[PDB]
From a paper:
Wall teichoic acid (WTA) is a polyol phosphate polymer that covalently decorates peptidoglycan of gram-positive bacteria, including Staphylococcus aureus. Central to WTA biosynthesis is flipping of lipid-linked precursors across the cell membrane by TarGH, a type V ABC transporter. TarGH is a heterotetramer composed of two TarG polytopic transmembrane domains (TMD) and two TarH nucleotide binding domains (NBD). Like other ABC transporters, TarGH uses the energy derived from the ATP hydrolysis cycle in the NBDs to drive substrate transport across the membrane via the TMDs.
To investigate if these differences were a result of targocil-II binding or the choice of ATP analogue, we determined structures of TarGH produced in L. lactis in complex with ATPγS alone and with targocil-II. The structure in complex with ATPγS alone (2.9 Å resolution) is near identical to the E. coli produced protein (RMSD 0.58 Å and 0.52 Å across TarH and TarG Cα-atoms, respectively). The first, in complex with ATPγS, shows the TarH D-loop in a conformation (D-loopOFF) that appears non-competent for ATP hydrolysis. We suggest that the D-loopOFF state in the absence of substrate could provide a mechanism to minimise spurious waste of ATP when not needed for WTA polymer flipping.
Residue numbers in the entry:
A (entry chain C), C (entry chain A): 1 to 270
B (entry chain D), D (entry chain B): 1 to 264
Write the structure that this text describes.
């Protein structure tokens, strides 16, 4: 119980340091590019264009889903994936790379992955704003149901932060985890409603049941319900919310316990 | 007359593996016999307030391991370190990034160091004036020469005010026109009665600056006492080593290394 | 014409140095892992398992193609993609990262990407041997048509080396190319017969015609013909071979010209 | 009495950008006026065979740029460098990787350096014996102390035999018991009549080792001639600089920096 208290205290006291270091990292990454920080938004747009060309025109010839054009359906569904993928990939190696600089300075070591994640949360917020503006240009306008984002958007950040908090310690102790993460990320990507709805195309007794255990399913469906279908998602899907909250709590507790156990020996393992 | 750092039976051991199979077997098998290297072995010294201590020894003696154990970055295998007051280490290369400019690097390093925003806003102009970079403070650090980068690092690092200070071969930085300012700044720390640990191979600076001397040979502490009584012994041993033939030097090194490596 | 001669001479004289540096890089990359260099083969196997689970059981329920089980069809088709992807991705940043060490030593600067590519060619060869052994275990045994590999396998290496030779100089001069390469790699991956045959599933007038301009199509089809269908591929598809050879020549010439033009100024741009 | 390096009107300019918009405009617009910094300006010196030359100056003078231009790593903006014979540079950190062990690092650095396999196989035992690492030669370099790593780098680098040699603050490495061997090895190069360029801030070593002195101030060559005639002037200027007040030092630095920065 002391682990959770220590990590919580560190984060709630070093919020501002987290934000400042995230901004500095964003500046560092895109230093040599002529366009600068615009690539954080340019790259996801090109990737989304490729994904729509492949999975939108080839498989289904751009047939509308639920009365919404497929382009906007995919746009709302996929606006979150880049943040999760980049955060989980980059923050797993955060402690390994950034320990040397801050080893000899009195530093709260549990906030290293969090600002790595924030450096991508910035681009996610920008992409979400762009997507909302485009959907408004289509003819779909916001309603009172848009206020569910204040609850749904922080959940994605908390999930990514907890997963990264566990995986950073695991990667520091054993270096095979960083190589093993790629297949798991691919599994999470393909077994989700981001690109397709398997109910119409194929059977739903087996494929759909496994999809419900994937948090990306819940996140994408909640965003679509808040932005597109104009409904209260928690009215009929509260059990999924409870299960996801339990998953987040379990991940946070395990990561905090491991980090508190092995922080003083991080020099030997590195 | 109060102790500042108290060290009792500090030991540091590292396991030596030759192939990946040996490491895998050591990790998996519960009880396994493998080679063990003693970086330090049963070091105990008591430091009082206001005492400047210089660490002297040959290459691979174990001075940096002791300094890191005192500074808190490293953890002893056996024993404890009892200290009072905050500890600061002087290292110029820690927080400087080539992509960030000088102004951005000042804020980055001061933030990672542990200072609040309001203090940084006040201390920034003094650092800028002390560094003497000029117009190049706005240019990226990757464009700097080595001396300019070292001067910026020293200017950022000199702002600390700890109870215990650890320095490592950083008494002066830059050309002759800049070393005097660094020497005066370092001496200012001495006049304020702070415990200082100095690790260097320069005997002239050690004689000019230090008060007590700790001699480390082969991971163990040979002698601890006043500078006037200990430094002549180290100088005499260094002079003696030059007169020995190559075979005798090799025999001395082999005898020194035999005790460190053990199987357990 | 002097550019081609210089680059050709450098490579043909520093073959052995290329091999030795490739081995050293392979040793460097996997130093901290407990399993060591086994990950170069473990990772592609897991990725192939995920790809077969998604695109083999979901889309078509593991229906055989051309009388061959889909698992072996995919295995032969996809054994090359990891090499091309990793080589093109990593070798684009070869000169940027490795110039500082060898700047002050008299070094042939045109061989830096080639050993980066060789470090992945090793794993490709291992995977190809494993695939052939598995296909033999199935009940499909080699014939006189397996000797086409001596012509087809070097072509993949030459294509990757030429593309990397151009992209390394382009990335050194302008740093946006390294960010732009990802979408192009995804386009090359999805518009290829590695995972599916669009002729049966959908229309073939439009999708199939574009696929024929993709070199990955030719490489995968040639490997499948040599290993599985037991036929001489060049008998009816010689025009595709000529077009691919022309593409390779064009890429090599352009890369050599650019590298010879801008080698002496590589310090200013870096 | 034959020239070894001949330098005529070597100039090096760098463009100074404050924001990304200025760089983008400079790249796109055909004719654009931007700030230009003169690292070197119209340097011409002729070096004969067997002449040891020491480069002296204050921080940011332009000594490393000249050494890199001579060594071929960098290219002048205007002018040419005419040289005969091969050029080798002494740099210990160039080819050492932490993941690779000492034995692997020897082969890696010697291969990147330009030696054939048969020569490496012969020269390896001499390097191993000279380094004096002992059992730790099989351990990874990341486990080494700083002194041991520097000694290994020096041992690998000392094997070169060029016509022209460039050294940069690497005359001696390690503790007192190891510096003498490095000094003898360096002197052996002097007895073989090779042109040597030495860049350092240590005036004692420059006086002991060098033959001619080149003084660089503000990107230009103040004086070129014998050590006995040039070094006293530099020492006198250094002594004079200490007596000046802070305002006068700032004025001198501003006057020096005014000529370097130009708009064109
Ligand atoms: C494909 C690859 C497959 C795997 C390959 C094999 C991997 C094996 C890794 C083993 C490992 C990782 C655990 C990872 C998380 C666990 C899973 C969680 C999963 C959750 C989803 C678990 O090792 C743990 O080490 C802890 C050390 O604190 C220790 O903790 C407790 O200790 C006290 C009593 O032991 C107790 O009083 C205290 O309170 C606890 O702190 C644990 O008891 C021990 O189990 C770490 O190994 C450790 O490494 C250390 C430094 O190398 C090493 O110590 C060094 O000490 C000296 C230095 O100066 C020197 O002598 C040596 O340098 C070395 O000896 C340890 O000896 C070794 O054990
Ligand atoms: C770079 C671009 C490359 C493009 C490559 C394209 C390959 C993909 C093809 C699309 C695909 C993938 C489904 C996606 C998987 C999602 C879950 C996986 C999750 C994994 C984690 C499903 O295709 C779609 O799905 C359904 C398949 O039936 C069907 O839906 C509805 O149909 C019912 C009508 O009665 C309706 O009653 C019911 O309500 C739905 O079922 C759709 O109409 C169909 O378009 C696979 O389809 C396969 O291919 C063909 C398609 O037709 C099809 O063969 C024939 O079809 C026509 C006779 O139908 C015929 O005219 C074509 O000549 C012929 O081809 C195959 O038999 C099918 O197996
Ligand atoms: C989203 C981003 C969009 C793009 C953003 C804009 C990017 C613009 C990049 C421009 C660029 C890249 C070309 C890339 C490949 C071309 C495409 C191929 C495609 C194939 C699929 C082309 O610039 C080229 O530079 C060459 C330099 O050799 C020059 O070559 C010929 O020069 C001679 C006569 O000019 C001729 O005698 C000789 O024989 C040739 O060598 C060319 O004429 C010139 O076009 C390089 O820019 C160059 O950068 C240099 C160092 O910064 C800079 O020189 C420096 O010189 C001093 C130093 O000491 C100092 O004064 C300054 O530091 C600077 O001045 C150049 O001035 C600048 O031009
Ligand atoms: N991670 C490590 N694993 C094994 N041995 C190590 C490790 N780190 C250091 N050593 C060894 O422990 C001994 C102590 O060396 P250090 O204390 O780091 O250097 P030093 O005593 O300060 O001497 P210098 O710095 O060269 S004057 C040396 O023999 C090192 O090679
Ligand atoms: N890439 C670059 N762009 C712009 N200015 C540069 C660049 N590289 C170096 N400079 C500047 O050019 C001048 C020459 O400095 P150097 O020659 O590298 O250092 P130095 O003259 O050897 O002095 P030291 O090494 O500190 S004793 C300095 O003012 C540098 O800041
Ligand atoms: Mg040390
Ligand atoms: Mg320099």
């Amino acid at each position: 119980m002391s682990a959770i208290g220590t990590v919580f205290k560190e984060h709630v006291k070093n919020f501002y340091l987290i934000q400042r270091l995230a901004q500095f990292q964003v500046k560092i990454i895109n230093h040599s590019n002529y366009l600068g920080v615009a690539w954080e938004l340019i790259n996801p747009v090109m990737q989304i264009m490729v994904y729509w060309m492949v999975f939108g025109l080839g498989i289904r010839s751009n047939a509308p889903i639920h009365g919404v054009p497929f382009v906007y359906w995919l746009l709302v569904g996929i606006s979150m994936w880049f943040f999760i993928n980049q955060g989980i990939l980059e923050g797993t190696k955060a402690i390994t790379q950034k320990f040397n600089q801050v080893s000899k300075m009195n530093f709260p070591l549990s906030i290293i992955p969090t600002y790595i994640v924030t450096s991508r949360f910035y681009g996610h917020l920008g992409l979400l704003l762009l997507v909302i503006i485009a959907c408004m240009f289509t003819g779909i306008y916001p309603s009172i149901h848009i206020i569910q984002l204040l609850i749904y958007v922080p959940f994605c950040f908390f999930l990514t932060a907890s997963v990264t908090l566990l995986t950073s310690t695991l990667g520091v102790l054993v270096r095979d985890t960083q190589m093993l993460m790629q297949a798991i990320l691919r599994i999470l990507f393909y077994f989700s409603p981001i690109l397709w709805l398997p109910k119409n195309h194929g059977i739903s007794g087996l494929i759909h049941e496994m999809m419900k255990y994937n948090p990306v399913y819940f996140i994408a469906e909640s965003y679509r319900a808040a932005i597109l279908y104009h409904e209260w998602y928690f009215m009929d899907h509260w059990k999924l919310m409870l299960y996801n909250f339990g998953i987040v709590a379990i991940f946070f507790a395990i990561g905090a316990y491991l980090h508190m156990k092995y922080r003083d020996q991080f020099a030997d393992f590195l | 007359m109060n102790v500042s750092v108290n060290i009792k039976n500090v030991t540091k051991e590292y396991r030596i593996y030759r192939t990946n199979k040996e490491r895998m077997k050591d990790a998996l098998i519960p009880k396994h016999k493998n080679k063990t290297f003693f970086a330090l072995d049963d070091i105990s010294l008591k430091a009082y307030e206001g005492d400047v201590i210089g660490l002297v020894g040959i290459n691979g003696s174990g001075k940096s391991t002791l300094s890191n154990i005192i500074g808190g970055s490293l953890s002893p295998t056996v024993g404890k370190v009892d200290r009072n007051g905050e500890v600061s280490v002087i290292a110029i290369s820690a927080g400087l990034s080539g992509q960030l400019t000088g102004i951005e690097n000042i804020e980055f390093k001061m933030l990672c160091m542990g200072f609040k925003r309001k203090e940084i806003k006040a201390m920034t102009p003094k650092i800028i004036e002390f560094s003497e970079l000029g117009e190049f403070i706005y240019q990226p650090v990757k464009k700097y020469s080595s001396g300019m980068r070292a001067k910026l690092g020293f200017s950022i690092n000199i702002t600390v005010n700890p109870d215990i200070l650890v320095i490592d071969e950083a008494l002066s930085v830059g050309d002759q026109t800049f070393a005097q300012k660094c020497l005066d700044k370092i001496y200012e720390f001495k006049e304020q009665n702070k415990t200082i640990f100095f690790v260097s191979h320069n005997l002239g600076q050690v004689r000019q600056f230090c008060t007590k001397i700790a001699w480390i040979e082969g991971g163990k502490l040979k002698d601890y006492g006043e500078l006037d009584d200990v430094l002549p012994k180290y100088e005499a041993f260094l002079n003696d080593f030059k007169k020995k033939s190559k075979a005798e030097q090799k025999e001395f090194r082999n005898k020194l290394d035999e005790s460190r490596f053990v199987i357990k």
